[PDB]
Amino acid sequence: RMKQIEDKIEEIESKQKKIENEIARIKKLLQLTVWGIKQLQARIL
Amino acid sequence: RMKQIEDKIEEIESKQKKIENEIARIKKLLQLTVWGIKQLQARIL
Amino acid sequence: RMKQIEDKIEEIESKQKKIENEIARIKKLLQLTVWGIKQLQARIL
Ligand SMILES: [Cl-]
Ligand SMILES: [Cl-]
Ligand SMILES: [Cl-]
Ligand SMILES: [Cl-]
């Protein structure tokens, strides 16, 4: 039962690192959409 | 104690599932705003 | 062994809280980026 607990934890940690990666990539794309909007803003103004 | 550990792990998994679901919604919204901005770019440039 | 399990759970929940905080921030920034887009649209059209 402790083995089963340990294996579930290791799976949880692994899925959590993939969420951290996904969030990191999201923030990079978001920073680029923000830069794109400010570019357009500069132009129409 | 193992009961308390098992309960904690099932809340963490539950919460991690809802994080994954919010991350998918964020990616779709992000995809929509990248497209909206591309629509502006083609019309403004 | 059970202490190491508990410790790891506490590490995982702490990271989860920080992830949730990142998701909420990213959602706000996204809402603002969408607003900025809809403003440019209304101005252009
Ligand atoms: Cl065991
Ligand atoms: Cl998580
Ligand atoms: Cl027990
Ligand atoms: Cl112990």
Record: contact B8-C13, CB cut-off 8 A: yes
Give, for A33, the enclosing helix (H) or strand (E): helix A2-44
Give resolution in angstroms: 2.0
Q: CATH code at A12?
A: 1.20.5.170
Please, which contacts does C24-31 make with residues 24 or more away whose CB atoms are closer than 8 Å?
C26/A23, C26/A26, C26/A27, C26/A30, C26/B26, C27/B22, C27/B26, C29/A30, C29/A34, C30/A30, C30/B26, C30/B29, C30/B30, C30/B33
Residue A26: give the domain boundaries.
1-45
Q: Which residue of B has its CA nearest to A32?
A: B34
Distance, in Å, from the CA atom of A9 to the CA atom of B7, rounded to the nearest integer, reads 12
> How far is ligand 2, taken at its centre, from the CA of residue A24, in Å?
14
Domain count, chain C: 1
| Shortest Cα distance, chain A CAs vs residue C33, angstroms | 7
> How far is ligand 3, taken at its centre, from the CA of residue B2, in Å?
4
